[model samples]
Target chain A: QHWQAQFENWLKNHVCHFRRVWATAQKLAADDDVDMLVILTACYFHDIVSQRSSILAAEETRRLLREEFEQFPAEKIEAVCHAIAAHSFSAQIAPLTTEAKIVQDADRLEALGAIGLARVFAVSGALGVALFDGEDPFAQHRPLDDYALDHFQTKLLKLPQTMQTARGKQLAQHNAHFLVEFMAKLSAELAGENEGVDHKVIDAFSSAGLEHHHH
Target chain B: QHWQAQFENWLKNHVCHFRRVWATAQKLAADDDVDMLVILTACYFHDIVSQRSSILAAEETRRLLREEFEQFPAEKIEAVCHAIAAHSFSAQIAPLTTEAKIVQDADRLEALGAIGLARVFAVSGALGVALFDGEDPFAQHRPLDDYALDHFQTKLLKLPQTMQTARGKQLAQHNAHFLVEFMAKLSAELAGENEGVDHKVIDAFSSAGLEHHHH
Candidate 1:
């Protein structure tokens, strides 16, 4: 409530991500019982100008902080800027500091977590994408961009491998398996077998346990 | 393949439902070590001319059976027609016989099972509905129809009570728990705690264990 309100907030929705990223950053920073203030500020402001995207958003974060919260500590301003700038996947900036590394990981967790699971459908729902190709769900012979299920293969299932913090990676693997399980269950349902998951999808997508069929 | 192909081919996508329902009916029918041919046949034809709907489709089923496969046997015709007619929930007709009961159970299983879980998002995606309202995902006060999550309460969560066959009810209970688990996980994520399921959701929706907050 303190920072969130001060930040003037906060779903996976706008304020929702602010709350989510801030909470996750809180957990990651507490592993060392350090960097809390920096990480929290970065999280709360990371998407402040998301359409500016991760690239220019760092400048916007700096702009907002310096102008509005002069009471916020000045010594930590640069750390928050760096963490916010380095946080986005699209920014492709290397996290050169522990604060930035934690920021990246905390933000990334939103992609593979259960609510992350719901976000996929919501986005696709808005875009009018088919949930899965009923005929060729796995993309054996076709392209992967036309449907929502293809997203697990192209992105969501692969997120655990890129998570940066030790705590974040552990948390990611745990939650990512839920998506893997969802994939398996959906496969089972599609094939007319309601009671089991498709072991083939497990073998294909599970990062912790697989010889991912590299076809 | 025999019946599916003979039914002239099969997704929850289209033929997908054909395959899914037939498969579920197959498992339910196997429970008795009987009713295989009758149940399979009913499952395959039940959705034929679905727009004519269960009300008129029963007449269509009889018409197709008599004209297309004149050798299918005279005695079983009425049984197939009755199962088809009573299978729809909208038809509001009670299952008057075991075949009709099994048919209803198998078809309804599709709404509570895993693929059924996916179907909610797919339909909402198609309709462009919000997957959930981040502010109040549980619908504490707002109405439930505007978001996809509401479909779980308005229909899916209550399906087990409507299932007819013992085998079907047991299956509904098992598969329905996945959706319950999903709700719990989503709650956990929205609170930014990625490692646990929200027990509150489990308490509210899990049929096997609940003092459902009846207000």
Candidate 2:
């Protein structure tokens, strides 16, 4: 009880914005496949292990659901817990239920829009990835394993294609379009057609043998 | 010594196209404030620690620099170290030195042009971030603790302003302009202006009250 209160407090403090977004998403998704209650519960508790050190998040989530809801039907609790487990993209599990899909979509939703980009860089800095290394990995093409450029070939570009739900796929396409056009513009600028700043360095990277990995 | 050899071997793997880009940037930057040797050396060694673990990245970079070139003259080592340090916009402790600035500019140059946007999504997926997360602190954040967006804000967006050498700065600005225009176009598409691929999710996010931080 004490721990849950503290956790709630932390969520209220640090992640209330997520709660707000979830609330909005619930309204928008109303009368859809999943109910607001299930999705909201899962979204609120999604990061229960966020502040814990070395705790198995999914496992703990299951345990919490089972332990706290003995009075409720067992199957529903299990479903909710599973949804919580599968909601995380990092957890690497597929969402099986409608509720799971909503939470998963909710979490995935956070990664796309303008807010998503802001949070990404914020998290990157917290993680201490040098911009050159994470954002522009092929800097020297020194065959470094962790170049930012390699990251694209291995990950970001693939996300839109990997979305699980219909809405997710749709949104993924939009986000991907923005992302692609964003790059196309980058190309034009690097080529020096745009006015303000020069494009020599941008051009250098292009001619420098860093071909786009067209995976 | 061993690492430099590995680095050199990696450089040889580049095709002529890649080398040409490097040559162009080098030639274009011939009159920049910092010496070419310092910029080149810094670029060459920039990713030494990132290839390993991303934990304590800044600390690790500093440690490696101290250990690897402890014997070099202080000035040369400082130049190289500064370049390495500033190569990442996230790890920037202070403004860039002349050489560090150009190298930083060059590194950012890679992100703004066409290839940079491709790398953006790639890196985002490799890092396992969701497609969109507006409110989650981990998913939504800033320069102090930003990960993806931080690169845009601290490095990519600022590239125009931070370009140290005149030529580098001009190039940086052009790339920045292109990126902004791209984001604007993306936003327009999201707003239902474009129909090529259909930016539904962006429209969704935008409609839902979230926006691309840049837009």
Candidate 3:
């Protein structure tokens, strides 16, 4: 209860604009058997720092946990900090513990599915990124850094294979399929070919987790 | 050639990031039997002022044309300004001249297709609007004033039906399909159902020009 209060306080005070990370963590926690404390702690700190230098967030997480949750054990604080540090794709820390793996997977899942699309545009909206390149909507010749839709090609669509846990992988697959279908639809929209998008292009994105097709 | 140089100078000095209105105008000029000078002049001046008080833009267009192109006829200047005033949806002036209709159609075309999506997100990104409401991605109960995705349903999808010319209507229909398919794909994504989207839900958007589709 004490840690929960502290976490909630930190969330209310420190976090603004991005609550999706925590929301995703909550959903993942309901099914996973990992330590909620470590996962939640990592969630609270994973994106507390800006993406440019995410290690600062992990360091900050350690400092806060040690200072505020004085009753908490030193090992528990270290575990939470490690999870927070490893969760960043840029940090590239190979999670040593199941809790760290679950936390990382939980964070990554937030960047995959429908909500991922929302977050993509939300951040793109916050930043002044265009929806797509005008000349090449699908990025045949150009890089993906300039546009929001390109981010899917650069990162989000490829995230399913990076998930750590079985449940994370399953959910990631489902979400990733939605992203693939969306891209196909967008390409059709851009190409003005509504009969269907190109099968060859859509086929490039593997249909792995889309097993029980009748939804 | 001299007039073109002057127009380019005006565009550079006056226009900021958006050039779609002028770009679309350039494309439509090839086939249309309108006054290219007047239509192009209207295109340059159309939204030179912001959307809030578009009458100001019309006034500005008239002022600029009279000042910059003294060698151009006075009556032609009036025609250009008239087209600029009528191009706005809120203004809703039935374009009297062929140039006016062509100019209006050119501007409206910018609000459709892949370019339209880019413009929407660019403005939405600038305004700090969220991508969509998390719980209701389709805005079943809530209003769409705050979300970028909802703007598709509220405005962008319906634009193709409002085109002025046969060519405009054809292009609009083609571009409108992209928006429609995007919505369907998004709905499927949000509902977490991958096999097929609920057609009945997507069908709420009017099928203006879409005819043959097996996909």
Candidate 4:
């Protein structure tokens, strides 16, 4: 309970998607028979040390578990640390346990849909990337680097197929569809095909009520 | 001729849209019977001292014409400087001559189309501005300081109606349409109505062959 409170406070300070990811993990936990403690612990700590490298984060997760929460059992701590370490796309640590798979899926799911779009542009803004290349908005010749639009092609769109769990794949596909539609509209607008975009489509999207609030 | 070459080289080096603005001015001059020399001179000098105030830039333009290009007639130099002085949006000097009107329109035209979109994002990235306010993408209550998307609402969209010439208003309206469409698509995607956006619209836009190449 104390660790849970700490996790919430940490999320409030960092101001990203910790609460959203936590909620998703809780929903997944409710449906599955997995160990909620290990999965939930992993979800909070997975990105806890994200200010540094994943390796450092993994190590920090273990250290926080062992030193700070001495009452938690050793074996579960070890399992939770493993899940946190393996959650990163860069780390690519194959999940051996069901707990790790759940954690990984929950984390990866955050990087899709409306939330994913918001995160991409936020990072691009910080990095000083253009919206898209004006000469080749589709990047036929030039390589994609800083442009927020190009990132959909290079990374976010491909995330759906990468899910490990059946539930994860299902959710990812749903979210990925939004990304596809967004790109289609953006491409259409850039190409000067205004007639192709209709008010009905726009009205439908507006009804979704998806929004982002940042500090 | 030597001064014109020097101006082109300066534009190539300092690197914004001076050459692009100059080209648009040339096309505008071609359509009309304005003095090409005065219009081109204003185009090159209008943004020459942009790092400082427009009043200072206007003063510098007149001084350069008098001191640097001694062979150029005094009367023509006076006409060129008047256009340069009046061309700035901030300066709000009434375009008393046809050359001034042409120069002002050509410069403002650069801020409307694909090129305009490129610049908005470029500055947004540099300043670490968000794509939009997630909670209120249109900035109903939030400030518009760092949000790139908000700038469209506050400034770029209104540019079309402010055009000083008939030709300027016509071209600005054409370019402004793209910006409007881009924002509409962006807003739709953000709202989660991706299903309304179709491949047909996407394909038509892709076919428009919109591209940007910058030096």
Candidate 5:
């Protein structure tokens, strides 16, 4: 309970990065079988340890939970750790528990909305990736094959169908529509189509790492 | 002389990606003995094959010279290619002739001043390198041991010493001081010590790829 309060405070303060996850977690709090506390705790600490290495994916999470929270009962720890393991978009493992389903839904939700568009690039840049690398972003092709656009075609658009909970699916569907609109706006702007940019909004977007990748 | 005139025209029409080298060549041109035409040609084409591959450096220059001039003499060819081979900062090969020295000086100058700072981060970002890949830039260390800050401290500061001609050294010394002042101003402004930036200047600087590493 004490950890939950602290985690909530941390989550709220860093809400910009995890807004979608918090919204999904809040909706799932009403479920009787879902342990919201476990899922929330897992989310906070999941990627913290992997700052020095590869992102905290499934196997790393299980190891982190086992080694770090040694005093906790194995069953409770396992429940939370298992959810963390299945939460990654890169992971193919299915969610088993109600907690896993909720947390995974929350994680995916964080990647769907308007804020999700910003994160897609932020995370990409953080991984030492340029948006198009050597390719021209202006060139048109259906369902791109790599990082930025591939993110939309393979995961972002399909998020609605893959969502676990009712509320998760609902939010993902809305965000999917919005994400497409956002991308089209970007493409238009990149093609030298936009006249005068809204300076104030663009300033805010740039600091948040949503700055457009103009050649 | 015809080839010299043609290269001068080429440098003027294209966006000078190699500004520092061009400037060095211009300064060297002030001296009577140094063949400004030969030196300028060498400086301009020093990295013409940089985007292609480093291994093909010597052969590529030779091939281009042979292709462009029907009766390109062996002596002139040797002069240009020798300068081209010695112009790189990383190559560490010292210039042996007057033409090579000026071209080398010009190229090194580009990697020294305010423009040099922009070039460093631009090239690094283009290559998808992290801002501080392995070491902090703030630490005080000698040139050889400090890979990150060495971009400024060692190479950028040492160009004056490496200058072969009197004019090259004079310009290099002034540019070196300019680089120091520029770094101080940029760092202070980035830390919010200066007055609000002029939007127009900021926009231009941002386009040059120097804005982000300001801090």
Candidate 6:
């Protein structure tokens, strides 16, 4: 609670993402056998250093917890720092601890909702990216990164398979289906299907994406 | 089709929004007794001047059509110009012609779909708006414009009833419900309901927005 209050005072933003991460992480940790404090601490402070550099985040988080919050379990600071460090996608460091795995999975789930859609466009706008580029917006085409929806096929739908936990994979599949419904609706809306999901686009994305089940 | 090719070369942006508007307007014009040519011209060139000033757009559009395109219908120029000018929400000039009303309603439908959601965040990031500000995001709150979801309450969900065509209003309601499903999922996602729609947000938006149906 003190760290939550302190993080609010320190950063004042990304509060919504932070809120969902810890909330999802807490649930995952509860359903499984994991240390809540380690998962909790990692989830909150993971992105505290920004996505600018995830490796740098560990040191900074370590300094803050050790030097600033003297009462926040010294024995667990390294565990929290490791999870935060490994939580980034580009961090490319596979999680070594169960708490870190859960923290990473919790954060990954945030990438598929309407929440994720807003993040994509807002961040895309920040970098001056176009929203869509297809003359015909089904996945029966080339060049993926040129549009916002393309990110779903290239990365988001693939996320459930990448999930590190059973419950995480389950939740991700559910959320990924929600995004698929949205993609279908958006495809119809874009192609002037007017009032419902566009099955052709759904089939295109499905046939294109669902081919990866080698398990 | 030539104007479409020309406009694609001219702006090279806002291509998606323009695409949907004309497509929706075309459908509406055919369903009713409006001049498709007037609605067509308006939908294509309405945002040509940007949302900077709708009044200025008419003069600019008139200048473009009158001086540049020789063989185009000279008699319909004024009607086209007027529809373009009145199509803006902030223009305060209500559409007086059937063509203008259809064009206006068609364009407004774009404001409710996932297409509209992308427009909101892209534009919001351009102006530096927070995605969400509520500690508890249901409409049982005090401030409104402090967050992105608040825009739904302030304007987006209110768009359907304001639509001016039988088909436009019908399409708007169907599209608005699409956004409502998104809102419901996002609410559950945010409040950590883990999976499924959060009916609290659906009910909150319903009770809050539905009370306007007095007819």
TM-score of each: 0.77, 0.47, 0.66, 0.59, 0.42, 0.86
> DockQ values for all predictions?
0.45, 0.11, 0.24, 0.14, 0.03, 0.59
Please report how far candidate 5 places residue A22 from its true position, in Å: 23
Give the alpha carbon lDDT tens digit for every residue of A1-215 in model 5. Answer: 55444444343322223433554576665656556667765666555544223234545655655553555544677776667667775556678887878877777766665335544544554454444322223335454444454566666778878898776776566556545544443333233222222344234222222225555
Best by DockQ: 6
What stretches of model 3 exceed 4 Å from their correct place?
A1-81, A112-121, A129-215, B1-32, B90-94, B134-140, B191-200, B206-215
Model 6 chain A poorest ten-residue lDDT run = A206-215
Tens digit of per-residue lDDT, candidate 3, span A1-215:
66357555474453422244555555566655666666767777676566346667777767766655676655677788778888778867788887787778767876775556556666776687766435244445676564777787778877877788767787778778767666665565444343355555467775733643456
- The ten-residue window of minimal lDDT in model 4 chain A covers A204-213
Deviation of model 6 at A114, angstroms: 2.6
Q: What digit string (tens of lDDT, one per residue) describes model 4 on residues B1-215?
A: 66455464344333335555666677666656667776766777676677236776778877766644556555677777778777766766778888888878877876766556656666665576656434343344774545676676566777778788776777777677666555544544344332233333333333233333446
- Candidate 4: C-alpha RMSD to true structure equals 10.0
What docking tier does model 2 reach?
A: incorrect
lDDT of each: 0.72, 0.50, 0.65, 0.63, 0.54, 0.73
Candidate with better DockQ, 1 vs 4: 1
What is the model-wide C-alpha lDDT for candidate 6?
0.73
Q: Write the per-residue lDDT of candidate 1 for residues A37-156, one digit (tens) a residue.
A: 777777777877763378677778877676555676667888887888887778787787798888788888888866677767667765767664442444556645547777777777
Q: Looking at model 5 chain A, which ten-residue stretch has the lowest summed lDDT?
A: A189-198
- Interface RMSD after interface superposition, model 3: 5.4
Q: How far out, in Å, is residue B100 in model 4?
A: 2.5
lDDT of 1 by residue, B1-215 (tens): 44444564222213446566776777777757645656656777777766337877778877777655565555777877778788877777678778778878888888875567767776777677765444344555764574778778777888887788978898888788888888888888877778888888887788744223444
Fnat of each prediction, in sequence: 0.59, 0.14, 0.31, 0.15, 0.00, 0.69
Off by over 4 Å in 6: A1-16, A72-74, A133-140, A144-146, A204-215, B1-16, B31-33, B133-140, B144-146, B206-215
lDDT of 4 by residue, A1-215 (tens): 75455464344333334455666766555657778777767777777786236666668887777654566665777778778887787866778788888778777876776546556655666676656534343435664555666666566767767788776776677676666555544444344332133333334333233323446
Candidate 1, which CAPRI tier? acceptable
CA displacement after TM-score superposition, residue A194 of candidate 1 (Å): 2.7
Worst 10 residues of 6 chain B by lDDT: B6-15
